[PDB]
C-alpha cells in the first residue's frame, strides 16, 4: 500500500487508513501518515517499530491518544500533529520521549494546558503553538522547559502578560506574539531573555509604550504596528544598542522625543508619519548607517546643515507636509538618488543648493511658493530623469543641463507665458504645460496633455482659404450696405416714423457685428502661419474681452428690436400714441443689451475659452453657466413673435395683406424674422450638442459653421430691405434731391 524508500522511510498519503499500518520492516526510521481517516489511537499502536526517528500525523482527525501508545519510542526526534482535532495538550504519552527535538501543534482547537505538561522533555528546541484558542500563557509548563530556542504563539486570545513569565528560558532566540489581544505589559515581564534576537508584537491593542524591553540587551529586530501607541518617550531604546530593524506604522503617533533615536549604531531605515506636534528636527548624533529617512506631517521649519555630512550613505529623502522655508546645501552628499519636497513654504532656489549631487535621478518640488530660480541651478547636476515642479507662481524657467530629462510637468503656472525651446529637450517623453499653444512648438513620440486641438490652432486661425474669403466677403458688404442704408434712412431731413427708426437701429447693431467680424479677419490676416506665438498674449489681453463683449451686445439688440418692431406693427394696425412709449422702450432694450453683454465680464475665465472670444461654441466643458440661459431667452422670444404673427394671420385676411402697404411692411418683417429663425437654429443646436451624449461632431466642423452661420443677418438684412422695399428708393430720390440742392 505504501511505497518503500529503501532507506528506512515510509510514506502514506490518502489511502484511507483508519488504523496504524502493520507488516512493515521493524528497522524503518521515518514514518509519515497524512490525509487519512484515523480518529483514535489504540493502546500499544507503535510498539512494533523500535527505531523510529521522525513522526508525521498530518490532517486526519485524531481525537484520543492512549497514554501507553507512545511508549517505547525513546529515540524519536521530530513530532508533527497539525490540523487534527485534539482539544487539549496531551500531557500524557509525551513524558516518555526524553530525546524529542521538535514539536508542532498547529490549527488544533486547544483551550487548556495541564499543569504537569511538557515535563521530562530535556532537549526540546522547537515548539509551535498557534492558531489555537489559548487565553493565558502557560507559565508553569513554559518554566518546565530550560532549553527552548524559538517560540510562536500567534492568533491566540491572550489578553495580558503577568510578571516573571519567562524567567527560566535562558536560550530563547525568537518570540512571535501577533494578532493577540494584549493591552498591558508588566515592567518585569521580559526578564531573563538575554539571548533574544527577534521580537514580534503586531496587531495587538497596546495603549502605551512598553518599558520591559529595556531589559533585553541583544534585541536585533523589533516589530510592532497597527497598535494604539501615540507617544514615544525619550530614552526608550537606551537599553538595547544593536537594532537593525524598527517596525512602526499605522500608529496614531503624536509626540516623539527629541533624543529618542540617538546612538543607534546599526539602524538602517527610519520612517515617521502622522506625528503632527513634533516641530523640531530629531537629534541623530551617532547614527551613521541610515539608508532611508522619512518624516511626514510634522511642523519642522528648519534643517541642520550637517545632515548628510553625518549621513554618508543616505539614498532617498522625502520631506513633505511641513513648514520648511530654506534649503541648506547638499554638496557633501554623493549617494543621494531621489528627493521629494512638497507642500512646503520654499520661495527661492539658489545655484549652490543642488550643486554636487552626482547620482540624483528623481526630483520633486510641487505645490510651493517658488518664484525665483537661478539660471545655473541645474547646470552641473548629474543625469536627472524625472523632474516635477508645478502649482507655483513661476515667471521664467531655465534650461541648463536638462538634456537627459524624460518627464517634465508644469501645470498651474499661469504666470509662465514664455514659449519652450524645442532644441534643448532632446529626449523628452511626457509634457505638462499650462497653455496648449506651447506644445505646438514640438508639434507632436512626445506627449503633451493639453489637447491643442482644432479649437486652439497652431498655424492658421481661420483654416480653409475658402472660409477666409467668405468671411472677408460678408464682412465687407455688411459694412458697406449697412452704411448705405443708415445714410439713406437717417440723413434725410424728414419726419422719422417708428418703423424707420427701428430698422435704423437694426442697421446700427448689424454694423457693430460686422466690424467685430472685421477685427477678427484683421487678426487672422496679421498672424498668418504663426498663430501659436500670438495666441497666449491675444487671449490673456483685453482685446479678446472687447471683441466678445462687442459680439454679444450686437447679437441681443437685434433680436429685441425686431420683437419690438413686430408688436409696434401689430398695434399700429390695431389702432388703424405709443411712439414715445416705444422709443424709450427701444432705449431700455439697448441698455438691456449693454448689461447682458457686460455681465459675463465680472466672472473669471468665461471669455478665454476660445481664441474667437465667442462663448456659444463653448468647448470640452463650458458647463452652461449662461449659454443655456441665452439660448432659452432667444428661443422663447422667437416663439412669442411666431405666436404673434400667427394671431395676425388669423386676424387679417390675405387679400387685405396683399392690398395693404402696412401689410407690405408686415411681409418684410416676416421675411426678417423667418431668416433670423433659420439662421439661429444651428448655433442653438451646437450648444445643445454636448448635452446629448450620442451626438458628436468634429471640432473641425463645429468651428467652421460657428464661424459661418453666426454673422449672416448683418449681411442680408440690408440687402433684403433695399432689394424689396420701394420705401428705400423714395428715400434715395429724396437724398438725391437734398444733395443736388446742397451742391
Amino acid at each position, epitope marked *: 500500500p505504501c511505497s518503500c524508500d529503501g532507506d528506512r522511510r515510509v510514506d502514506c498519503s490518502g489511502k484511507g487508513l483508519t488504523a496504524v499500518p502493520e507488516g512493515l520492516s521493524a528497522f524503518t526510521q521515518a514514518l509519515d501518515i*497524512s*490525509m487519512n481517516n484515523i480518529t483514535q489511537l489504540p493502546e500499544d499502536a507503535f510498539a512494533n517499530f523500535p527505531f523510529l526517528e521522525e513522526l508525521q500525523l*498530518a*490532517g486526519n482527525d485524531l481525537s484520543f491518544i492512549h497514554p501507553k501508545a507512545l511508549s517505547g519510542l525513546k529515540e524519536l526526534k521530530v513530532l508533527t500533529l*497539525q*490540523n487534527n482535532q485534539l482539544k487539549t495538550v496531551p500531557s500524557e504519552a509525551i513524558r516518555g520521549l526524553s530525546a524529542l527535538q*521538535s514539536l508542532r501543534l*498547529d*490549527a488544533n482547537h486547544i483551550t487548556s494546558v495541564p499543569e504537569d505538561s511538557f515535563e521530562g522533555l530535556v532537549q526540546l528546541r*522547537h515548539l*509551535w503553538l498557534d492558531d489555537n484558542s489559548l487565553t493565558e500563557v502557560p507559565v508553569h509548563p513554559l518554566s518546565n522547559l530550560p532549553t527552548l*530556542q*524559538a517560540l510562536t504563539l*500567534a492568533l491566540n486570545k491572550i489578553s495580558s502578560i503577568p510578571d516573571f513569565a519567562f524567567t527560566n528560558l535562558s536560550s530563547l*532566540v*525568537v518570540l*512571535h506574539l*501577533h*494578532n493577540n489581544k494584549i493591552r498591558s505589559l508588566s515592567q518585569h515581564c521580559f526578564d531573563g531573555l538575554d539571548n533574544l534576537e*527577534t521580537l*514580534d508584537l*503586531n496587531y495587538n491593542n497596546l495603549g502605551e509604550f512598553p518599558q520591559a524591553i529595556k531589559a533585553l540587551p541583544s534585541l536585533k*529586530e523589533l*516589530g510592532f*504596528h*497597527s497598535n494604539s501607541i501615540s507617544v514615544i518617550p525619550d530614552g526608550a531604546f537606551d537599553g538595547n544598542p544593536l537594532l537593525r*530593524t524598527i*517596525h512602526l*506604522y499605522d500608529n496614531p503617533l503624536s509626540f516623539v522625543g527629541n533624543s529618542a533615536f540617538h546612538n543607534l549604531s546599526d539602524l538602517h531605515s527610519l520612517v515617521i508619519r502622522g506625528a503632527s506636534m513634533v516641530q523640531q528636527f530629531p537629534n541623530l548624533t551617532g547614527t551613521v548607517h541610515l539608508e532611508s529617512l522619512t518624516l511626514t506631517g510634522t511642523k519642522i521649519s528648519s534643517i541642520p546643515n550637517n545632515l548628510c555630512q553625518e549621513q554618508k550613505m543616505l539614498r532617498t529623502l522625502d520631506l513633505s507636509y511641513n513648514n520648511i522655508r530654506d534649503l541648506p546645501s547638499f554638496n557633501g552628499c554623493h549617494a543621494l538618488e531621489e528627493i521629494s519636497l512638497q507642500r512646503n513654504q520654499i520661495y527661492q532656489i539658489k545655484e549652490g543648493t543642488f550643486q554636487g549631487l552626482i547620482s540624483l535621478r528623481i526630483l520633486d518640488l510641487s505645490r510651493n511658493l517658488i518664484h525665483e530660480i537661478h539660471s545655473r541651478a541645474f547646470a552641473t547636476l548629474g543625469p536627472i530623469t524625472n523632474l516635477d515642479v508645478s502649482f507655483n507662481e513661476l515667471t521664467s524657467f531655465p534650461t541648463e543641463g536638462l538634456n537627459g530629462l524624460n518627464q517634465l510637468k508644469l501645470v498651474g503656472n499661469f504666470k509662465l507665458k514664455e514659449a519652450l525651446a524645442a532644441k534643448d529637450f532632446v529626449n523628452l517623453r511626457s509634457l505638462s504645460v499650462p497653455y496648449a499653444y506651447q506644445c505646438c512648438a514640438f508639434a507632436g513620440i512626445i506627449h503633451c496633455t493639453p489637447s491643442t486641438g482644432a479649437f486652439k490652432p497652431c498655424e492658421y486661425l481661420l483654416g480653409s482659404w475658402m472660409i477666409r474669403l467668405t468671411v472677408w466677403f460678408i464682412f465687407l458688404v455688411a459694412l458697406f450696405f449697412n452704411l448705405l442704408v443708415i445714410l439713406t434712412t437717417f440723413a434725410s431731413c424728414t419726419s422719422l416714423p417708428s418703423s424707420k427708426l427701428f430698422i435704423g437701429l437694426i442697421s446700427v447693431s448689424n454694423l457693430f457685428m460686422g466690424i467685430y467680424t472685421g477685427i477678427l479677419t484683421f487678426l487672422d490676416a496679421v498672424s498668418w502661419g504663426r498663430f501659436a506665438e500670438f495666441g497666449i498674449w491675444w487671449e490673456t489681453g483685453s482685446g479678446c474681452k472687447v471683441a466678445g463683449f462687442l459680439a454679444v451686445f450686437s447679437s441681443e439688440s437685434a433680436i429685441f428690436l425686431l420683437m419690438l418692431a413686430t408688436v409696434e406693427r401689430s398695434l399700429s394696425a390695431k389702432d388703424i400714441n405709443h411712439l414715445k412709449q416705444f422709443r424709450v422702450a427701444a432705449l431700455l432694450a439697448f441698455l438691456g443689451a449693454t448689461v447682458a453683454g457686460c455681465f459675463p465680464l465680472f466672472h473669471r475665465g468665461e471669455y478665454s475659452a476660445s481664441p474667437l472670444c465667442l462663448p456659444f461654441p463653448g468647448g470640452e466643458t463650458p458647463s452652461l453657466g449662461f449659454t443655456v440661459t441665452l439660448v432659452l431667452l432667444n428661443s422663447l422670444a422667437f416663439l412669442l413673435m411666431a405666436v404673434i404673427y400667427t394671431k395676425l394671420y388669423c386676424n387679417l385676411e390675405k387679400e387685405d395683406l396683399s392690398e395693404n402697404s402696412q401689410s407690405s411692411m408686415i411681409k418684410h418683417v416676416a421675411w426678417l424674422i423667418f431668416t433670423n429663425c433659420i439662421f439661429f437654429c444651428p448655433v442653438a443646436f451646437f450648444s445643445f450638442a454636448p448635452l446629448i451624449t450620442a451626438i458628436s461632431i468634429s471640432p473641425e466642423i463645429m468651428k467652421s459653421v460657428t464661424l459661418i452661420f453666426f454673422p449672416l443677418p448683418a449681411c442680408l438684412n440690408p440687402v433684403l430691405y433695399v432689394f424689396f422695399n420701394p420705401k428705400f428708393k423714395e428715400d434715395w430720390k429724396l437724398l438725391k434731391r437734398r444733395v443736388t440742392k446742397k451742391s
Partner: nanobody
Amino acid sequence: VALAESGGGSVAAGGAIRLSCTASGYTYSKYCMGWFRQAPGAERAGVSGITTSPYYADSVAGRFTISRDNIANTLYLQMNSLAPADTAMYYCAASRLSCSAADFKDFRNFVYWGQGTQVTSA
C-alpha cells in the same frame, strides 16, 4: 533555513504553469512569503505575497493564484494566459518578521532567499 524551487521552462504564449517551492527550518515566519520577479538590467520586484487578503501586483491581477499548504509546508504559484513580458527569473522570498502588504514593494526587508528558476513565454 533552506529553500528550494521547482517549475519553470519554455512555454508558448497563453499557456499555464505551476511553480512549487519547499522550505525547511523553523526560524522563518510562515505568515510572510513572496514571489519575486527579476528581468536583466533591473532590480527585483514583488509579484505576489501572503500577508496577515493576499497581495497581488498591478500587472498580474486576475491571472495569478498563490496558495500555501502547511500540511506539507509548500508554497504554490500558478499562472495562466501568460504574456511574453513575463519572461524572467523567479525567486521565492521568506522573512523573519510578520509583514503587511506595504512591505512587499521593497525587497530589502526580506532575508531568506532561494536559488531561483527561469521561465520564458513565447
